[PDB]
Amino acid sequence: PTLAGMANRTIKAKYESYDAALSLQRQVLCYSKDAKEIYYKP
Amino acid sequence: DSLWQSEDLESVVDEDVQRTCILHGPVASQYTSKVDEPIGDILNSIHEGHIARLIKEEYAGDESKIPVVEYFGGKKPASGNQVVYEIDSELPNKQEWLDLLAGTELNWLQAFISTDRIVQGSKHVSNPLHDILTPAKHSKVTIDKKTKKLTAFENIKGDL
Amino acid sequence: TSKAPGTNEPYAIVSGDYNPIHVSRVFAAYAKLPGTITHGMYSSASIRALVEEWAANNVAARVRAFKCDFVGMVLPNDTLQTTME
Amino acid sequence: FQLTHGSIEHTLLVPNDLFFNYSQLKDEFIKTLPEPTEGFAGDDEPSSPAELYGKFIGFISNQIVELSLKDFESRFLDNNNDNIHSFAVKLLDDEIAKVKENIVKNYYKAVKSINKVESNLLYHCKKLVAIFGGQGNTDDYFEELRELYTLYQGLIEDLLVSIAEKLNQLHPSFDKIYTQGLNILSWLKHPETTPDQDYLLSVPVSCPVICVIQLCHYTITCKVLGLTPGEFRNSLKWSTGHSQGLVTAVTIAASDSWDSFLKNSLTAVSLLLFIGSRCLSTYPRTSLPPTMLQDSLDNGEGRPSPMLSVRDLSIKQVEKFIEQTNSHLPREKHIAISLINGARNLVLSGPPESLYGFNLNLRNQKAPLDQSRVPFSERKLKCSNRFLPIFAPFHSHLLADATELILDDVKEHGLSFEGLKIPVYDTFDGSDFQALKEPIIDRVVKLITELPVHWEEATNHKATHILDFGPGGVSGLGVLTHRNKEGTGARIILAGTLDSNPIDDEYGFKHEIFQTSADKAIKWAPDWLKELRPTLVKNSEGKIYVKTKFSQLLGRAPLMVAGMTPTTVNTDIVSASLNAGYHIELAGGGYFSPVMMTRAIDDIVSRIKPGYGLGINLIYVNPFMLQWGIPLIKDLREKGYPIQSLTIGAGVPSIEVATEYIEDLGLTHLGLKPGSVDAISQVIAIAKAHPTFPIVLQWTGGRGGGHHSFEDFHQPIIQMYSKIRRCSNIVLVAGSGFGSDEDTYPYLSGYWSEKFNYPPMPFDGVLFGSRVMTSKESHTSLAAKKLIVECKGVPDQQWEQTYKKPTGGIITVRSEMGEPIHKIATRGVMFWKELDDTIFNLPKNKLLDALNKKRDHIIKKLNNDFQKPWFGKNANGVCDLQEMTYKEVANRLVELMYVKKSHRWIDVSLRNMY
Ligand SMILES: Cc1cc2nc3c(=O)[nH]c(=O)nc-3n(C[C@H](O)[C@H](O)[C@H](O)COP(=O)(O)O)c2cc1C
């Protein structure tokens, strides 16, 4: 997850209050780690 | 054991203050400015300043308006001429009985009854009156006048 | 849980489906079905409300193909335990 | 007669034929009573003889009833005949609320017409103020009206019936949003018919019902005292209301004789019905995403609502957060200040989703944390925000478009409030509604829908007695405004519920309004400016003293010198400072055994005049000090020494330790200086355990001193003063950076709290620790005194940045035990700070390696900068202790342990070591 991490810290640094106010529940997922969430296999 | 050096500086290495540690308050250092003045003088200055503020504000600057008592003290924060009290055993509260005997005015007998301690040559021991005037059953007490005298009677050998 | 309405008149009025078996007692009795059963379309819409509420996030972009089959029958004032997975 | 059930009975003297009839009614009554429950802990089993009497009279209420009434009143209601509530709560305190309310109900069923002026201590001495609660005060509000209807049937059944007809007639007027109706009588009498709490809480329903609760409480307060509304209202100085209750306030101001009171109630109910219906129609609440409420719930939050209450934050901080959320939301789902219940209590209106995003932001910014070890200036802010039980965003732009519709609908029904007798404080602007060009209803509707509520400004009262008639009760408006007016002399009475009075007796209750004895009927909240005013007094000799709760006990000025291990261990400083006539506590820190402490005490006693008294200061951190000092203090007290006070330093003792210190050793008062909010709570608990023993606090903010339990000097004693003064024996003195009359008089007179917008908060005394160092009596060295004087000071706001640099020549250094000490930034103190920042903070393995690598440098620094030099040094050259001949070791010991100029050793033990 080279891009997932930097997208995470981008939304943290820039879109944290935006996500809070708009009630946007961003779910950053990477095929390497979060494959269960990708395939909906909890 | 770093605190005594500031008191005894004649012993530390070369009597240099910068080597010694002195405890002090940053907010009080502005007010602390004068060298070698009496502690009584400092506290007198503070008390007299407070008295000046109070006399100017709440008394129009007149000292005659200050309430006067014979003695100032002995009052716990959590608190006619011819009278006769017939003490019983039902429930005479010690505090209430002593207050009634002491009276309202801040006079010699008020002090001498309500005070809980007695001084014996600079020695604070228990007040003998809180023992003598303690509720018994027949310690009838009588004050002749507001500032004249007091007497306590008992039915000794069946005679008051 | 979804609860069928006390009466089928409001749904009949709004939807235009004036089938008497839902509102009139006499027609249901004649039809031999058990009482003024609620509209199957009311049931579908009421449970698709549950889908739009829980499966989505009140988001209208998620409203898409919704198949439904009225396998059984529902009476008025009936409490129905919906289940979706 | 033998009316009894279990081990309780009541005797009634009945006439003969009346006795036969009473026997008939008695066997009929026991035919209905339940069996004893072996404790009367059941439901219908009476738990008192008069509870049984009430059950009996209530049974008859379905010639003998008058006899039972009169006998009950004579036996139990001693002059409190109209005050059955007082009896009910007397049972609650001495002899639960269900049976108390049941006896109240039975009595009120039994009474004839109650048109008799009750002597409620002149109805609380003729300033009487009537506040009405609003929406969101409580979640299960409807049970309040349930109990009200069930138990006060004879008084407000007519009103409830009138409201039911009024609302069922109001629905045809425009329209019914009411999926389950609004027939309140059917809901009340049939519990099954009532819908769920969500539908009850829906605003078009709930607003009429909250009006019902308020009007019912007002009607009860009238009928019980036998006061017509036209004259009860006259008894009130003024009246107002919260977000919703203001309409009831203006209506009560418009009250009149009972026939006109019913019309007034019609007006208020119709207005609230229109407000609720129009507001819901304009902004109907929608489904709420379950994932969103689940996220809210699993972070210690309630169900989202259109109003979000935030506490422990200022309007400015809360406003900045709303501006962030609004900037990132569109205008139509914005958040706006709905109402300002106080300085640290706010509620914000808007969509539930917008307020959920708001709460996400607030949770991100807030902290859970045990910050006691963190400086106050850099401490994260705490807050407890939650959504109120409401289903409408009142006081927001969302309902602004409902306004014009509400007024247009009002104009059709002739609704108009013009003849207001008492003032009605404007809920937003604060002024009286009487002096308004626009219609009163127009202004009030615009208030409830659009404008915010500055609650404190609205209730800027000048009065002594306030009573809340709204919903919530303990959770209602009265308790909320009591916090805002704790110390201003305002007594809040919750005239909407009967319950056991507060364990601290802070706000009144229905029992308190209805009491008749003028000891519990007349209750005034503490007015700190008046009851703790710094007074003056004069002695027979003419000396002027400052009479306070602290000076009164000591008999001398309320200006003490606190205990000091370096500064207040000398015999002379204590003796002469005492002879000046000011209390000083000799510190034990310079004394390491009872023999030294006894010698110092004996020297001071010999050097002070007769009739005098000193104190002692003991540190609680070291158990050795306590175990050798407490027995010594007890011994000296049993001898009769002038020891007057024991000041326990950093660390308030346990309850058992305070108990034995208060009883075993006979001190006049116990100095119990805390250093935190929790420590103040421990001191308060100790004072409660000993309500009669004086306990001087000596609370220090940690801004100045030596060992400072770093806090702010203002905030802890701002939020604990109220809880401190609910204790007859706690004496409040505080130091921490006082050195002059200019900076101590505001604290003495209580004006220091005006800047914080709290009531005046007078202090009994003040302690001066750092100002008395330069005093001639102190034996601190003259060079040390010069350094103390030449080091400048620091205003209060800038004290707390002393951890980083020498603020005014003083810095904070870590102790051997880790406690911070304020020390003047000498070269030695700066070396201490460097070491406890760079070396002592490292782990053990890193400590030793760093110790060597920087030992090469520390040996020099100790030689040139610190009290303790490197012992290994010889004539200048750095050497280790191993690089040392016996001759030069002995020479160094002479040089460093024996004073040449004074021709003596520093200490006999050092001489023995040599
Ligand atoms: C040199 C010094 C020593 C102190 N020693 C003690 C002590 O041993 N025990 C204690 O409880 N407080 C001690 N204190 C705290 C003082 O009792 C008092 O709270 C403090 O000096 C108030 O500071 P301020 O006058 O600058 O506002 C000490 C203070 C100083 C300045």
D716 and D584 co-located in one domain: yes
**How many angstroms is it from D713 CA to the middle of ligand 1?**
14
Half-sphere exposure of B52 (CA within 13 A, CB side): 10
Phi/psi of residue D731, each to 5°? -110, 130
User: What is the three-class DSSP state of D897?
Assistant: helix
Nearest-angstrom CA–CA distance, D307 and D643: 59
Residue numbers after which chain D breaks, C to N beyond 2.5 angstroms: 62, 95, 126, 368
**Min CA distance, D67 vs chain C (Å)?**
53
Active-site position among D243, D255, D270, D709: D243
Interchain proximity A20–D360, CB inside 8 Å: yes
D132 and D259 co-located in one domain: yes
Structural contact between residues D432 and D237, judged by C-beta atoms closer than 8 angstroms: no
Q: How many residues does chain D have?
A: 914
Q: Which residues contact B99 (CB under 8 A, 6 or more apart)?
A: B114
The C-alpha R_g of chain D, in whole angstroms, comes to 35
Separation in Å, CA C57 to CA A18, D272, D850: 18, 34, 59
The C-alpha R_g of chain A, in whole angstroms, comes to 12
D673 CA closest ligand 1 atom index: 11
Query: Looking at residue D328, which CATH number applies to its domain?
Result: 3.30.70.3320
D554 and D669 co-located in one domain: yes
| D220: nearest Cα among D497, D618, D572, D424 | D497
Structural contact between residues D759 and D753, judged by C-beta atoms closer than 8 angstroms: yes
CB of D302 within 8 Å of a chain B CB? The answer is: no
**Min CA distance, A23 vs chain D (Å)?**
5
What count of other Cβ atoms lies within 10 Å of the Cβ of residue D530?
11
Range of the domain at B159: 82-160
Q: Which chains touch D (3 or more CB pairs under 8 A)?
A: A, B, C
Q: What is the rounded end-to-end Cα distance, in angstroms, of chain D?
A: 98
Q: How many Å separate Cα D799 from the centre of its chain? A: 28
Half-sphere exposure of A24 (CA within 13 A, CB side): 14
Q: Which chains touch C (3 or more CB pairs under 8 A)?
A: D
Which residue among A18, A19, A23 places its CB closest to the CB of D356? A23
D48 and D195 co-located in one domain: no
User: What is the three-class DSSP state of D522?
Assistant: coil
Q: Which chains touch B (3 or more CB pairs under 8 A)?
A: D
In this structure, what token pair is assigned to residue D316?
């400015």
| D342: nearest Cα among D484, D204, D554, D236 | D484
Interface test with D, best of C7, C50, C58, C77 (most D CBs within 10 A): C58
Strand partners, C79: C3
Phi/psi of residue D454, each to 5°? -90, 90
What are the percentages of helix, strand and coil residues in chain C, rounded to 5? 45, 5, 50
Q: Which residues contact D338 (CB under 8 A, 6 or more apart)?
A: D243, D307, D347, D348, D349, D393, D394, D395, D396, D452, D453
Nearest-angstrom CA–CA distance, D807 and D809: 5
In this structure, what token pair is assigned to residue D882?
């191993």
D789 and D753 co-located in one domain: no
Q: How many residues does chain A have?
A: 42
Which residue type sits at D426?
A: D
CA angle D507, D513, D519 (to 5 degrees): 80
Interchain proximity B36–D828, CB inside 8 Å: no
Q: Are strands D766-767 and D559-560 parallel, antiparallel or unpaired?
A: parallel
**Min CA distance, D393 vs chain A (Å)?**
17
CB of D360 within 8 Å of a chain A CB? The answer is: yes
**How many angstroms is it from D748 CA to the middle of ligand 1?**
20
D102 and D126 co-located in one domain: no
For ligand 1, say whether the CB of D810 is within 6 Å of any of its atoms: no
In this structure, what token pair is assigned to residue D436?
């308004």
D40 and D175 co-located in one domain: no
D721 and D759 co-located in one domain: yes
In this structure, what token pair is assigned to residue D874?
């010889």
Separation in Å, CA D386 to CA A24, D391, D449, D832: 21, 14, 22, 47
For ligand 1, say whether the CB of B23 is within 6 Å of any of its atoms: yes
Residue numbers after which chain C breaks, C to N beyond 2.5 angstroms: none
D296 and D276 co-located in one domain: no
Nearest-angstrom CA–CA distance, D860 and B69: 65
In this structure, what token pair is assigned to residue A28?
């950053």
Residue D119 known to be catalytic: no
What count of other Cβ atoms lies within 10 Å of the Cβ of residue B23?
26
D381 and D401 co-located in one domain: no
**How many angstroms is it from D767 CA to the middle of ligand 1?**
9
In angstroms, this model's resolution equals 2.6
**How many angstroms is it from D576 CA to the middle of ligand 1?**
19
Interchain proximity D354–A20, CB inside 8 Å: no
Interchain proximity D328–A23, CB inside 8 Å: no
User: What is the three-class DSSP state of D785?
Assistant: helix
Range of the domain at D494: 119-285+392-524
User: What is the three-class DSSP state of D703?
Assistant: coil
Residue from D592, D696, D707, D709 whose mutation best tests the ligand 1 pocket (most atoms within 8 A of CB): D707
Separation in Å, CA D894 to CA D19, D871, D872, D874, D875: 108, 11, 13, 12, 13
Q: How many CB pairs under 8 A join B and D?
A: 342
Nearest-angstrom CA–CA distance, D870 and D874: 10
Nearest-angstrom CA–CA distance, D649 and D643: 17
- Experiment type: cryo-EM
| D538: nearest Cα among B54, B119, B112 | B54
Nearest-angstrom CA–CA distance, D649 and D626: 11
Residues D244, D249, D250, D251, CA torsion sign = positive
| D702: nearest Cα among D741, D672, D724, D673 | D673
Helices (H), D690-808: 715-719, 721-724, 741-749, 782-790
Query: Looking at residue B102, which CATH number applies to its domain?
Result: 3.30.1120.100
| D539: nearest Cα among B160, B52, B66 | B66
Nearest-angstrom CA–CA distance, B31 and B52: 19
- The helix or strand, by DSSP H or E, that contains position B113, with its residue range, turns out to be helix B108-114
Structural contact between residues C34 and C75, judged by C-beta atoms closer than 8 angstroms: yes
CB of D356 within 8 Å of a chain A CB? The answer is: yes
Q: Which residues contact D732 (CB under 8 A, 6 or more apart)?
A: D549, D550, D697, D699, D721, D724, D725, D763, D764, D765
CA angle D582, D585, D590 (to 5 degrees): 140
Which DSSP state fits D137?
S
CB of A17 within 8 Å of a chain D CB? The answer is: yes
**Min CA distance, D364 vs chain A (Å)?**
9
Structural contact between residues D583 and D558, judged by C-beta atoms closer than 8 angstroms: no
Hey, which bits of D463-598 come out as E strands?
465-468, 491-494, 508-509, 535-538, 544-547, 559-560, 585-587
